[PDB]
Structure formats: structure tokens, C-alpha cells
Amino acid sequence: CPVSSYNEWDPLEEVIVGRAENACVPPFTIEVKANTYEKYWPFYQKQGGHYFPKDHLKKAVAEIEEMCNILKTEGVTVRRPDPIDWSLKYKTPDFESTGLYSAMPRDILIVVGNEIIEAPMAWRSRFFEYRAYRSIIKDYFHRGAKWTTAPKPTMADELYNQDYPIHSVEDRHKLAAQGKFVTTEFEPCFDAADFIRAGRDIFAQRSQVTNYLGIEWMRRHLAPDYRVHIISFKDPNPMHIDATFNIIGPGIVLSNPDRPCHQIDLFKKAGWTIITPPTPIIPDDHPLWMSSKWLSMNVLMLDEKRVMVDANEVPIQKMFEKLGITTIKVNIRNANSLGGGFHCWTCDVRRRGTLQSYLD
Amino acid sequence: CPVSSYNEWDPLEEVIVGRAENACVPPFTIEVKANTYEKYWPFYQKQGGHYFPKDHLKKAVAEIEEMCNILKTEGVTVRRPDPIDWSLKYKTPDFESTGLYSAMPRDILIVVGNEIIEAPMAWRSRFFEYRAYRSIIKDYFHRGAKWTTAPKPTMADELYNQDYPIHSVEDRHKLAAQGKFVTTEFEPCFDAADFIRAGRDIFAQRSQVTNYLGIEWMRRHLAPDYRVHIISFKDPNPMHIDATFNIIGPGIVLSNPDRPCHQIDLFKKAGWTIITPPTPIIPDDHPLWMSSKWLSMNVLMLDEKRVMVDANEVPIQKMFEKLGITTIKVNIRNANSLGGGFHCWTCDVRRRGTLQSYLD
Numbered sequence: 028c029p030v031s032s033y034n035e036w037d038p039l040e041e042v043i044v045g046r047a048e049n050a051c052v053p054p055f056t057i058e059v060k061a062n063t064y065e066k067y068w069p070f071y072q073k074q075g076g077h078y079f080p081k082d083h084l085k086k087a088v089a090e091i092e093e094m095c096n097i098l099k100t101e102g103v104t105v106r107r108p109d110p111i112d113w114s115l116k117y118k119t120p121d122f123e124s125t126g127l128y129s130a131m132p133r134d135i136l137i138v139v140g141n142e143i144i145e146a147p148m149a150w151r152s153r154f155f156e157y158r159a160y161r162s163i164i165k166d167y168f169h170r171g172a173k174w175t176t177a178p179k180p181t182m183a184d185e186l187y188n189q190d191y192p193i194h195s196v197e198d199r200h201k202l203a204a205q206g207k208f209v210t211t212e213f214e215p216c217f218d219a220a221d222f223i224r225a226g227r228d229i230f231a232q233r234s235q236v237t238n239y240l241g242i243e244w245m246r247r248h249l250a251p252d253y254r255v256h257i258i259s260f261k262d263p264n265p266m267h268i269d270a271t272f273n274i275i276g277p278g279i280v281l282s283n284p285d286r287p288c289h290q291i292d293l294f295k296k297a298g299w300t301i302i303t304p305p306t307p308i309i310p311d312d313h314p315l316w317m318s319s320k321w322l323s324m325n326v327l328m329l330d331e332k333r334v335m336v337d338a339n340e341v342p343i344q345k346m347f348e349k350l351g352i353t354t355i356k357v358n359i360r361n362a363n364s365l366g367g368g369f370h371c372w373t374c375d376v377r378r379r380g381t382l383q384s385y386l387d
Numbered sequence: 388c389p390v391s392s393y394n395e396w397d398p399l400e401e402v403i404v405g406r407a408e409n410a411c412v413p414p415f416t417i418e419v420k421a422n423t424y425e426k427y428w429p430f431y432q433k434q435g436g437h438y439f440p441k442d443h444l445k446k447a448v449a450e451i452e453e454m455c456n457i458l459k460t461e462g463v464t465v466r467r468p469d470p471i472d473w474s475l476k477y478k479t480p481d482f483e484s485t486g487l488y489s490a491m492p493r494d495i496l497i498v499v500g501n502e503i504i505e506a507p508m509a510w511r512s513r514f515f516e517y518r519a520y521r522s523i524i525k526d527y528f529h530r531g532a533k534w535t536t537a538p539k540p541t542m543a544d545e546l547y548n549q550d551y552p553i554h555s556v557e558d559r560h561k562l563a564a565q566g567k568f569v570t571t572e573f574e575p576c577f578d579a580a581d582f583i584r585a586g587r588d589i590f591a592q593r594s595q596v597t598n599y600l601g602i603e604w605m606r607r608h609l610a611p612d613y614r615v616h617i618i619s620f621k622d623p624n625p626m627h628i629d630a631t632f633n634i635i636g637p638g639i640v641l642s643n644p645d646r647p648c649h650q651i652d653l654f655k656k657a658g659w660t661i662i663t664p665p666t667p668i669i670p671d672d673h674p675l676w677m678s679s680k681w682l683s684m685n686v687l688m689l690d691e692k693r694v695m696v697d698a699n700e701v702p703i704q705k706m707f708e709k710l711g712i713t714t715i716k717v718n719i720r721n722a723n724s725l726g727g728g729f730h731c732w733t734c735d736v737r738r739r740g741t742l743q744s745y746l747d
């Protein structure tokens with residue numbers, strides 16, 4: 028029973044850590060543009076289809092190897108996806124594209140109990156991302172784990188709102204209020220990272236890459252054992268929930284101050300502790316091609332009292348320290364450029380613990 | 388609850404009927420050759436990648452339209468997959484290929500209860516076959532049905548036994564005895580048609596296209612409600628179980644005389660009636676590019692006492708008649724060339740009845 032994880036904090040025993048090797052800038056299509064800050068449009072317009080700066084990828088490779096060494100020191104078993112050239116151009120009857128990377132296991136795999144679920148994805152450059160993880164998954168399957176792949180979309184034009192006000196407009200907030208984004212409700216789609224686990228309750232967010240059909244598929248597939256709840260936040264470009272509402276312990280959650288939750292009272296009434304982390308201190312001159320500066324709260328909990336946190340983000344380190352949580356500081360400044368922090372770069376396969384309810 | 392079918396005989400209410408339109412001869416790769424009679428090798432060697440003879444496809448289209456008219460007359464609701472050009476060449480990071488058709492819903496979709504399952508397939512030319520059925524499936528999903536897609540294989544060389552004694556050898560029987568075929572155990576794969584339902588018990592056959600990993604995935608995915616049993620027969624080229632062991636009623640099964648079951652005693656001890664149909668009378672000059680002459684026993688039961696059977700196969704018609712089963716004769720002689728009879732050309736979506744056990 029190699030696979031067994033019901034939440035984000037029980038004592039970690041096995042984890043899959045991503046790879047930065049051969050990452051490629053995704054073609055600048057509608058869904059990618061919806062996620063990109065105006066500042067990087069030229070980079071994407073010129074680099075689409077080529078490898079991310081190799082000098083930079085080399086630094087990220089180094090940081091993640093060290094992170095892996097630390098995990099092993101901390102008693103965690105580490106597995107890595109297979110190396111793959113993401114520049115290969117593929118063609119389905121609906122579209123053609125080059126790949127992205129297998130840097131973020133959290134984006135595609137989610138473990139609910141003894142079951143590993145491969146998300147369908149919503150980006151065309153991530154259609155074949157599951158190929159890097161099949162060697163690991165088949166091993167767990169041979170060893171008794173359940174394996175599920177949610178329905179893979181066609182990703183035909185109908186899935187994308189071709190006339191989304193990407194170009195800048197902020198009334199994206201308005202559509203966002205209407206539960207309307209760059210992805211339509213044409214067919215199910217989602218990134219596993221829009222779901223965050225708390226035992227019998229999983230919280231999901233309708234985002235640029237996760238539609239209501241995708242959430243309904245998960246809800247229906249996991250009921251009656253698990254309840255999937257939908258929550259929303261003040262965010263004009265949501266993609267993944269772990270740099271917005273990161274659950275760090277039974278009844279403790281880190282809530283991004285810039286992205287308040289519309290349903291925060293559900294949690295206050297449950298007697299949950301909502302901690303708002305201090306601001307990130309990452310330099311504005313450092314490239315973050317795929318995300319915001321909020322990767323600082325994208326921590327990974329080794330256990331309730333041990334958190335893997337960025338070495339450079341001292342303010343948040345002190346925050347955990349005043350709470351009695353031992354900080355294990357690792358530097359992943361360059362890996363951050365690919366789009367994620369510790370929680371994004373990993374997928375907890377096995378955590379010592381049982382299925383419980385924390386919402387009462 | 389549009390979807391609800393636990394077996395092959397309860398009163399039929401809704402069915403998906405395949406399309407012959409734009410069917411293409413599949414590229415002559417190892418797995419295709421393993422299924423092709425020496426007699427048609429030249430046809431495949433010359434026609435690979437092109438449409439099957441259009442004059443012939445036109446006759447099949449006619450026969451299936453009539454079959455659909457009859458089903459509507461018999462009170463059955465008919466749904467059809469979307470028309471698609473199967474000649475489009477696609478490319479995954481593992482291989483490149485042209486498609487086949489969406490003529491056989493039974494090959495790719497199987498209904499277990501309120502859940503529709505899309506098989507992964509094992510042939511490269513059938514990788515994207517699910518695209519023709521997504522419009523129908525999403526409708527059922529919106530209407531409350533469960534939807535599952537088994538893990539889609541990579542279909543890389545490792546899945547095929549490159550040195551299979553296809554060329555003719557018959558010791559295929561020997562490997563067949565060893566549970567060894569053209570598909571390895573590299574990753575899960577299967578055609579839904581290798582499974583045949585009897586309520587709480589589903590029987591599966593390890594075949595050229597269905598491996599043990601594929602069967603184990605199904606067994607594990609459906610337990611504990613359903614028990615998936617593996618059975619074998621004397622067959623040097625198994626692909627699909629419905630022209631070998633077609634279950635026609637609670638405890639009644641048609642067993643192909645040329646393909647005896649190694650576990651027939653399991654059924655005799657259960658008090659099941661094993662009927663061996665008389666030989667097919669289809670002319671040897673008629674082309675059957677994808678199967679044997681045994682399509683005659685590939686009947687579809689409208690209910691326990693009503694069977695849709697081929698108009699030309701009088702011997703088997705008399706057989707059902709002596710058993711008190713009303714024969715609804717339809718001619719599908721040209722549709723047979725594509726590879727299947729009534730059971731292959733349909734997928735029972737809803738049958739009036741409940742989940743029961745028939746093995747005691």
C-alpha cells in the first residue's frame with residue numbers, strides 16, 4: 028500500500044518531486060495568454076516552442092537536487108518522473124502543440140486515499156504531460172494502488188473562450204464573479220492543484236483551468252466518501268489554489284491577503300484558524316514566468332510541526348517559528364521561475380495517518 | 388438516470404448504434420497483422436490508410452439505417468456517434484497513425500450499472516476513437532450518469548511483442564496457452580468487448596487486445612460490487628468475447644463450438660444452459676476483413692424472448708425459434724465486413740432491470 032494520503036499535513040513518507048529538465052515555453056495560445064503578465068508577453072511571443080533559458084534551467088536543476096537531498100535527510104522517500112524532451116510537437120485530431128514540462132507533479136496528480144488520480148489538464152501544451160509519470164504510477168499500481176485518469180478533453184476551440192478580455196481589462200473580475208473564465212463548460216477539464224485536501228473534505232476552485240464540469244466529475248467520482256466543496260476568492264486570474272488557500276494542519280489554513288475567500292465564514296464557524304502570511308520579499312527583477320510572487324506561501328508540510336519553506340523568505344520563516352513550527356529552509360529561487368514552490372514541485376504519495384473529518 | 392444496464396438481456400430501452408461512414412483500413416502494423424487472415428494481407432498492404440471500398444460502405448450504411456428503423460419500431464431509443472473523418476493522421480509522442488471507424492460501440496464503451504466506461508483500446512489506429520462518442524457521453528453525464536475513462540496507454544513499441552509469430556504458425560495456441568499474445572504487459576490495455584456482463588459477475592478474456600493488467604484494472608476499479616472473472620477458450624487469435632461466449636439470458640449462454648471454454652465446468656456446476664449454435668452459412672466469397680464467420684451468434688437481445696438476428700442465417704433462426712425466442716430478422720451482410728454483428732454494432736445504454744446474481 029505505497030499510496031495513502033488523506034491531507035496535506037500528516038507525517039510525510041513518500042513524495043514525487045518534479046524535474047526542470049527540458050522545460051519548454053508553451054505556444055502563446057489564448058489559455059496561456061490568460062495566465063501571462065503583460066511584462067512577459069514578448070518572452071512568450073519569441074520563445075514559444077523553445078526551451079526555457081538553459082542557464083536558468085541548470086540552476087533550477089541544482090536547487091531541486093538539493094531539495095531532494097534534504098527530503099531524504101528528513102526521512103522521505105523521493106521518486107522522480109522520467110526525463111523527457113518537451114519540445115516534441117504532437118498532433119491530435121483537434122489541435123497541434125509542443126509540450127511544457129513535468130516540473131509540477133501537483134498540477135497533474137492528486138492522491139485521495141489509496142487512489143492516484145491523473146487530472147485531464149486544460150492547456151494544450153500539457154495534454155501529454157502524464158507520460159513522464161507512468162513509470163512511477165504503474166509501479167504503485169502493481170503494488171496495490173488504485174489508479175484513475177479523469178476524462179481527457181479534446182481541447183478543441185470550443186473549450187476556450189476565444190474572445191476573453193485577456194489583453195488587460197480587469198473586468199475579468201466581473202466574469203470571474205460570474206464563474207466565467209477562459210475555459211468554457213464544453214467538456215470536463217481541471218488541474219489537480221485547484222483541489223486541496225482536508226481528509227473527508229476537499230476544496231476546489233473554479234479557475235482558468237478548472238471548470239464546473241471538471242469539479243462535478245470529481246465530486247461525483249469521489250462521493251459518498253469525500254465531499255468536494257467549491258470556494259472562490261478575489262482573483263482576476265485564478266489557476267491552482269495552493270498559493271491562495273494552503274491548508275497546513277487540522278483546522279489551520281494560510282490565506283493569501285491579496286486573495287480573500289468569499290466563503291471565509293464557513294471556516295470561521297468551523298473554528299478554523301486563518302493565518303495571513305506576510306508579503307513575499309522576492310525581488311521584482313527576478314523572472315516569474317508562470318506565477319505571482321506568492322509562491323512564498325506555497326509551503327509543503329513534512330508534518331504538523333515541520334514545514335519546508337523558502338530560505339530567502341525570512342518574514343514567513345519567523346511567522347512559522349512563532350507558531351512552534353520548525354522551518355526547514357531550502358533555496359528554490361530559480362525553480363520558482365517555472366511556476367511553483369514546494370507544494371507545486373511535489374506530490375505527497377504516502378503520509379502516515381487516517382481518514383478524518385476536520386470541519387466537524 | 389438515462390444510463391442503467393446490468394446485463395445483456397433485460398428489456399432494452401436505449402442503445403447507441405455505430406456508423407460505417409468514413410471507415411479507414413488501419414495501417415498494417417504488428418497488432419493489425421495479428422488479427423488479419425492471410426487471405427486479406429494484400430488488401431491491407433495496399434489499402435492501409437485509405438477508406439474501405441466506398442461502394443461497400445454505402446451498402447453497410449443502408450443496412451444499419453434499416454436496423455435503426457427496426458429498433459425504433461421495437462420501442463428502442465437510438466443514439467448515433469458523430470460523423471468523423473477517420474483518415475486524419477495524428478501523432479502522439481510515441482507513434483503516428485490514421486484512424487479506423489466508430490462502427491463498433493461495443494469495442495470501446497461498456498455500461499456497468501449507471502456508469503459508462505470508455506475502454507483504453509490496444510490498437511494505434513483506435514487511439515482517438517472515443518472522440519466520436521463524447522457528444523452522447525457528455526449528455527448522459529449532464530443527466531446524472533457516471534463517466535469513467537480507463538487509463539489511456541502510450542502504445543509505445545514496448546506494448547507490442549514485435550516478434551510475435553503472426554506470419555502463420557499456430558503455436559500462437561502455445562503462447563495462447565501461456566496467456567501470451569501480441570500485446571505485452573507493459574501497461575494496461577483492453578477493448579470493452581472482451582468483457583460480457585451477467586449482473587454482479589462480468590467475465591473477461593485475455594486476448595490479443597486485452598492484457599492481464601487491463602483486466603486487473605477493471606477488477607480493481609469495479610470491486611467490491613462486481614466480480615470480474617477471467618475465462619479462456621481454444622482460440623489462436625482472440626479479440627472480443629461476444630462471438631465466442633455470448634450470454635443471452637439468466638443462465639443461458641451461446642458457446643461457439645470452435646472455441647470451447649476451458650472453464651465450462653464452472654458454468655455447468657452453476658446450472659447454466661450452454662447452447663452451441665449451428666454453423667454460419669455466410670458465403671466464403673463475401674469479405675470479412677476484420678473477423679471470422681462467427682458473427683452469426685453475435686446476436687443482440689431486445690429482451691429475454693426477443694433476439695435481433697441475421698436474416699440470412701436461417702439455421703440459427705430456427706434454433707432460437709425452437710427455444711421460444713422471437714426472431715427479429717435484419718440483414719447486415721455488408722456491415723459484417725467491418726467486423727461485427729448486432730452486439731458489436733451497439734451498446735446498450737439502458738435496460739429495464741436490477742442488479743442480480745445468476746451464478747448463485
Ligand SMILES: NCCC[C@H](N)C(=O)O
Pocket residue numbers: 220265266267268269270317318319320321322366367368371
Ligand atoms: N502552482 C501554483 C501557482 C499559484 C497561482 N497561479 C499564483 O500565481 O499565485
Ligand SMILES: NCCC[C@H](N)C(=O)O
Pocket residue numbers: 580625626627628629630677678679680681682726727728731
Ligand atoms: N467484434 C467481435 C469479433 C469476434 C472475433 N474477433 C471473431 O473473429 O469471431
